[PDB]
Amino acid sequence: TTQSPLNSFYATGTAQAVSEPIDVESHLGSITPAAGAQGSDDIGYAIVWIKDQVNDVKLK
Amino acid sequence: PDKTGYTNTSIWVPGEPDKIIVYNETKPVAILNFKAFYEAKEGMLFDSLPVIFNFQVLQVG
Ligand SMILES: [Ca+2]
Ligand SMILES: [Ca+2]
Numbered sequence: 722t723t724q725s726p727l728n729s730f731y732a733t734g735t736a737q738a739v740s741e742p743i744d745v746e747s748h749l750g751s752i753t754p755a756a757g758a759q760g761s762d763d764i765g766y767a768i769v770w771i772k773d774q775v776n777d778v779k780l781k
Numbered sequence: 782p783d784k785t786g787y788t789n790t791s792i793w794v795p796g797e798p799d800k801i802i803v804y805n806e807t808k809p810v811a812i813l814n815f816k817a818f819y820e821a822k823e824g825m826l827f828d829s830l831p832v833i834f835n836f837q838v839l840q841v842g
Pocket of ligand 1: 757758759840841842
């Protein structure tokens with residue numbers, strides 16, 4: 722009568738990667754010496770947000 | 782001005798206390814005092830010629 726191939730069974734899921742691993746927002750400052758002067762000053766900072774299940778980051 | 786030694790202190794030209802340069806503020810300053818030793822030429826009469834000094838910065842740190 723009917724001979725089934727016994728293959729018509731399926732299960733399906735989805736995957737996505739919609740975000741980059743890091744986000745960088747800058748809060749740097751300024752360097753204001755006189756002409757030819759020597760000095761040092763703190764510039765500011767830069768926030769590096771870490772995204773989903775990211776544990777170690779290697780940057781350049 | 783916000784320290785013990787510099788409460789209400791001034792800076793003035795040496796030997797001339799009435800010429801105050803800095804008063805209760807932070808202003809790095811240097812004072813150069815000029816003194817002349819001269820021999821006028823015999824018989825020369827002159828009125829208003831200038832004496833000119835030029836300063837040239839060479840290095841800064
Ligand atoms: Ca220099
Ligand atoms: Ca991870």
